[PDB]
């Protein structure tokens, strides 16, 4: 498995770079927010009799 790449130096670079673009794209495309939702979702009925 490794040896294959030892003889084939560039092809590794291709794997790495493809991953570089994949991750570098994956920031630009992914949502940024402090908190991944962590609560039971809850709906809220609300009324008002004056």
């Amino acid at each position: 498995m490794p040896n294959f790449f030892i003889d084939r130096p560039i092809f590794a670079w291709v794997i790495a770079i493809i991953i570089m673009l994949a991750g570098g794209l994956a920031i630009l495309k992914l949502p940024v927010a402090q908190y991944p939702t962590i609560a039971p979702p809850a709906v809220t009925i609300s009324a008002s009799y004056p």
Partner: protein
């Protein structure tokens, strides 16, 4: 993203405000998170530095130290790719988790770069012959350490 939309929704308003009327932001979660990620990114860079120093100080060569250094970014951004593909976000928690990740992962690289070095330091065989030999004695360890860690 919601707040990012809210400054948008609101950015269109000011030109039609009456005289004397001005907006103000007394309570705001976002800059906490811009800063929270600024801080981790800067710990990451300076970590990459510090790794490169312990690498030079041990292998004592400009050339050698390029190898493990290049391999870290490839791993860490590579993670964005895969956790994007599992629907997980670049949050406070996740992004913070990967610094620990950087820490663990660095040595996955160096154990093998080193081991090749040490192997070529006695039988004195070229980088190919040595690195291959190195893969032969260890490569099997790497998958299992990874399995058991997981």
């Amino acid at each position: 993203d919601t707040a990012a939309a809210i400054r948008a929704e609101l950015a269109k308003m000011e030109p039609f405000f009456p005289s004397g009327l001005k907006i103000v932001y007394p309570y705001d979660t976002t800059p906490f998170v811009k800063i929270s990620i600024h801080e981790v990114v800067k710990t990451l860079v300076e970590a990459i530095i510090l790794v490169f120093l312990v690498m030079y100080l041990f292998l004592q060569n400009f050339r050698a130290t390029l190898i493990p250094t290049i391999a870290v970014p490839v791993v860490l951004l590579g993670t964005f790719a895969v956790l994007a593909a599992f629907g997980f976000s670049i949050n406070t928690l996740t992004m913070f988790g990967m610094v620990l990740a950087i820490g663990l992962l660095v040595d996955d690289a160096i154990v093998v770069v080193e081991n090749v070095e040490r192997v070529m330091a006695e039988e004195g065989l070229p980088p190919k012959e040595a690195t291959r030999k190195s893969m032969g004695q260890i490569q099997g360890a790497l998958v299992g350490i990874a399995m058991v860690l997981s």
